Nucleic acid binder design. Structure first.
Ligand SMILES: [Mg+2]
Ligand SMILES: [Mg+2]
Ligand SMILES: [Mg+2]
Ligand SMILES: [Mg+2]
Ligand SMILES: [Mg+2]
Ligand SMILES: [Mg+2]
Ligand SMILES: [Mg+2]
Ligand SMILES: [Mg+2]
Ligand SMILES: [Mg+2]
Lengths: 183, 171, 51, 67, 147, 114
RNA sequence: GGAAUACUGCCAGCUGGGACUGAGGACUGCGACGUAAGUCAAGGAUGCUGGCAUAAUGGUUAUAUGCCGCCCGUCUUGAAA
RNA sequence: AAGCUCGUAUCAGUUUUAUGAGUGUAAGAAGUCCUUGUUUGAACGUGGACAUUUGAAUGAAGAGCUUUUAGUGGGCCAUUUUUGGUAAGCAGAACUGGCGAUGCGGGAUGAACCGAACGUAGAGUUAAGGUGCCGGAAUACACGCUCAUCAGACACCACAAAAGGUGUUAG
RNA sequence: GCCCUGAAAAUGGAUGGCGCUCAAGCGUGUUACCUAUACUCUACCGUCAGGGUUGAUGCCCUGACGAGUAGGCAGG
């Protein structure tokens, strides 16, 4: 990607990168006073409490859900380091409807080996590159229970858009800083 | 925040029988690239009939000040919103960078005109090459040959609650 | 009986990831890139500098 | 007429007593269910009822003339 | 707080234990609980579930009904299992020879089976004979026939 | 243009009951001059069935299952084709995907500042 | 023309100070370091040392100090009103 | 609350796609093909078969059906549409929230405001609101404006005529 | 834009008080800091669920939950 941008500039062109295929979404507001349709969309995205996060595959069917729940979440494009740290520290699997910590490759192999996933790094790979079994791997992952940001939210009022000096909405690449603070 | 200047070049999405659409470039003052892209789509929708869902961002690049350690006079032509319409304003700002001048302008608009970032439009920031074209007195008074001025009544900050001497304001 | 963070506990890190040993040995977190001398186009420079 | 902003005759030529005949949509009443009049047009039923009322008035007038 | 998608502390139920204080019925429940845990036999699961039912849900099964069940093809040598009372029927005059396992037999039903030439056994003897319910036929009495 | 019982129709006027505009229902009764339509209206928390009587010209046939029928025909054809010539065929619809990388050349398309 | 630095991001880089916690109770597992025997920070605290051995810690009780605390029941949306 | 069955069953206050109106409907066993049988076309079928690449996304451990029964039902407020208005208030419909049954943080104080819903505790981080003193927290940093013979620290409605002024600042 | 006038009664009182004038006022920006029964981790209680087990309505392992009037069910 770095070389493509350098070569396109050298040839008088502009290299347009591929759009992001993955977002990380964190619920930012509590459960009091939520409109029913955003409430339903939050339940469908498994954001049942404040500071719960999930990975979402970017399609037209999910971008509209994100647009619906924009005032109540902060989301963006996660990086490999963010995903690796999230899975290593707060990675829990859903086995027999139970929240089981991913402390050994045996659990991951036993529950996801039919899809070719043998280790926590295979799981991270399927998350970062949205593979054929992203739905199964992401639903195997229990929703991440994050803390409050360690250095604060950076704003005096959270419930404005990130463009307008608030917190909610698509902050794109800055979700990495926010989530590493909250992790 | 502390502003940066970007160039944002975008276009309509390519279609069959209309390939290679025109590229449009804007110079945007913003704190970050997310704000810069949002402002670009706002202005592109306001001027052309291009929507974010119908187009794409070809490129966004930060533009640095060419000579950040040279003092310059800037003429800033801005346009702000009112219920009667949009009104022009021309201000002159002496500073060492375009982003510094734009930040000074935004602070001055917030102080005086009670204006906000979403309502203020920057139409032009242009350096004045020759001092003879400067026509604001608060800028012209600093262009005097051999400019010297004192700073009477210096107030020194104290680190302690009680002082054992009466303070002096000499400088 | 107690969850241990691989990002802090080296033994748990090596248990989960056998390749962390190679990563640390080869210093792959500070890998140097090959130096290339590609130059941008004059049209790109003019577009960037244009008002 | 409240729904429009016009004054209309309440009977006769273009009268307001026959607007249900030309109404574009009529809800079928629940009370008509379980009867053989379920499949009949409510506009036609109202025309029949109006004609029956007219004939009842004519019969009452002829009764007054007989008496 | 959390926006719950389902109710909290919901009892599944599923009739864990019988309401009876019969010690022998409790012993049979214990035996078939062990069997349904350690045998992986659907017959043992069904019998354990049936042992938990109430009287109105355990209707009696007649010897005529048992004979009609044995009238099937390939079932003439099977063991009839009724988790409940086997009652007598005088409307049937020809009864086959068979082994019947039941909780209770009436005097008439027991006499009729023994006279035909078979045996009336208990559920624990059935568990000894067929630990996985081999060659068994579970009969249930009519529910809606009572009113 | 004849409406049979069970057809799915759209209510499209060419003044009262303006709520039943653009609604789609199932025909339950047809006469010489009028057509009956069943509308499920959300009353409280449960759909309730309401009977409507319309003039013929104020409704039209609904094309709300045309794509489904054509897709079923195409799916059967594609599965038969892949049975004839063995290859994996993807028979499910997919959402719009994010677009891939591309190179935009400024050959004659030099960006114009506005 | 040759550099540096800023900014942003990454490191399965190193290292110092502080706070709270020590659930569990033979072994079993997954690992790591060692040619090996073995060792280990790897499925939850051990080791060493001192003072006291009693009103000292602690409890009770009477009060003082900081902050919080409207009078219950009933009847009406609501009740200091 | 009791029984029967099913549990890749049943689905959903959601999106997508297709089709409408300016939010409704549809998205598979309550399918499909061949063979030409019922009164050359619509509509009803005799006989065979295609499965776990069985027909968009996301979520979902409980679902469907028969019975069985305690307490209760004309309330207030607010938002969003629509019709008609008044000196001004507003009056009538439809949907959706909040409250009664509910404590906690903040707004000095409080039915409908901001935050957040509650097992007993420890440590950490925060929300809303704040950091002169009462009072935990910068008499922080920075650019401007203002001097009021009872300024202002507010609800953004009214007083309000975008009126008056030889106040001041920027256009 | 800010400031003054732009109508006011009637016990003595209120930006909550003190007070504050390059503010401790007004607009804006950048940080640091304070602390909720909220969030994160841990222990403990109870409930529910899923497993294992030849004082067995016991024991063991694991996971998630905990507001409440009328009222219901359960154990004391
Ligand atoms: Mg801190
Ligand atoms: Mg805040
Ligand atoms: Mg003491
Ligand atoms: Mg008090
Ligand atoms: Mg203090
Ligand atoms: Mg007045
Ligand atoms: Mg204060
Ligand atoms: Mg300020
Ligand atoms: Mg709780």
């Amino acid at each position: 990607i770095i070389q493509a941008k350098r070569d396109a500039k050298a040839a008088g062109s502009y290299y347009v990168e591929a759009q992001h295929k993955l977002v990380f979404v964190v619920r930012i507001k509590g459960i009091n006073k939520i409109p029913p349709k955003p409430r339903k969309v939050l339940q469908l995205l498994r954001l049942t409490r404040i500071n719960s996060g999930t990975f979402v595959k970017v399609t037209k069917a999910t971008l509209e859900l994100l647009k619906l729940i924009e005032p109540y979440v902060a989301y963006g494009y996660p990086s490999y380091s963010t995903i690796r740290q999230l899975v290593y520290k707060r990675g829990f699997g859903k086995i027999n409807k139970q929240r089981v910590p991913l402390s050994d490759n045996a659990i991951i192999e036993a529950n996801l080996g039919k899809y070719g996933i043998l280790s926590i790094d295979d799981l991270i790979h399927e998350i970062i590159t949205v593979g054929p079994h992203f739905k199964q791997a992401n639903n195997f992952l229990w929703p991440f229970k994050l803390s409050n940001p360690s250095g604060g939210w950076g704003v005096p009022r959270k419930f404005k858009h990130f463009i307008q000096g608030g917190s909610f909405g698509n902050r794109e690449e800055f979700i990495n800083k926010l989530v590493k603070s909250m992790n | 925040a502390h502003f940066k200047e970007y160039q944002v070049i975008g276009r309509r999405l390519p279609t069959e029988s209309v390939p290679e659409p025109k590229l449009f470039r804007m110079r945007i003052f913003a704190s970050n690239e997310v704000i810069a892209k949002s402002r670009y789509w706002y202005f592109l929708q306001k001027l052309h009939k291009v929507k974010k869902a119908s187009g794409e961002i070809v490129s966004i690049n930060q533009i640095n000040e060419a000579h950040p350690t040279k003092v310059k006079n800037f003429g800033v032509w801005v346009r702000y919103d009112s219920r009667s319409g949009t009104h022009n304003m021309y201000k002159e700002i002496r500073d060492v960078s375009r982003v510094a001048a734009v930040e000074t302008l935004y602070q001055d608009m917030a102080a005086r005109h009670r204006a906000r970032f979403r309502s203020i439009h920057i139409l032009k920031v242009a350096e004045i090459e020759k001092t003879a074209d400067v026509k604001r007195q608060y800028v012209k008074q600093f262009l005097t040959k051999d400019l010297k001025f004192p700073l009477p009544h210096r107030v020194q900050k104290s680190t302690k609650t009680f002082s054992y001497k009466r303070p002096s304001t000499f400088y | 009986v107690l969850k241990k963070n691989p990002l802090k506990n080296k033994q748990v890190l090596l248990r989960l990831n056998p390749y962390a040993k190679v990563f640390a040995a080869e210093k792959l977190g500070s890998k140097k890139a090959e130096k290339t001398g590609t130059k941008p186009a004059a049209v790109f420079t003019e577009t960037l500098k244009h008002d | 007429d409240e729904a429009s902003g016009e004054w209309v005759p309440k009977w006769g030529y273009k009268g307001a007593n026959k607007k249900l005949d030309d109404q574009w949509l009529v809800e079928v009443d629940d009370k008509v269910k379980g009867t053989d009049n379920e499949l009949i047009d409510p506009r036609t039923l109202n025309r029949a009822e109006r004609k029956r009322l007219v004939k009842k008035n004519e019969k009452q007038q002829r009764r007054n003339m007989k008496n | 707080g959390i926006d719950h998608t389902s109710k909290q502390h919901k009892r599944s139920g599923h009739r864990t234990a019988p309401k009876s204080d019969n010690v022998y019925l409790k012993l049979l429940v214990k035996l078939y609980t062990f069997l349904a845990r350690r045998t992986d036999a659907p017959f043992n699961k069904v019998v354990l579930k049936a042992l938990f039912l109430s009287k109105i849900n355990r209707p009696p099964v007649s010897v005529s009904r048992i004979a009609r069940a044995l009238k099937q093809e390939g079932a003439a040598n099977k063991t009839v299992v009724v988790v409940g009372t086997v009652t007598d029927d005088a409307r049937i005059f020809e009864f086959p020879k068979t082994t019947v396992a039941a909780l209770r037999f009436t005097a008439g039903a027991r006499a009729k089976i023994v006279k035909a030439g078979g045996e009336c056994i208990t559920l624990d003897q059935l568990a000894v004979r067929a630990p996985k319910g081999q060659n068994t036929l579970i009969l249930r009495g009519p529910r809606n026939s009572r009113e | 243009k004849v409406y049979k019982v069970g057809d799915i129709v759209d209510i499209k006027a060419n003044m009262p009951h303006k709520f039943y505009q653009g609604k789609t229902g199932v025909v339950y009764n047809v006469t010489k001059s009028s057509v009956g339509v069943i509308i499920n209206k959300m009353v409280g928390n449960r759909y309730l069935e309401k009977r409507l009587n319309l003039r013929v010209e104020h409704i039209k046939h609904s094309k709300c299952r045309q794509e489904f029928l054509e897709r079923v025909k195409a799916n059967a054809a594609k599965r038969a084709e892949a049975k004839a010539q063995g290859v994996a065929v993807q028979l499910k619809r997919q959402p719009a995907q994010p677009r891939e990388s591309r190179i935009v050349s400024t050959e004659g398309n030099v960006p114009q500042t506005l």
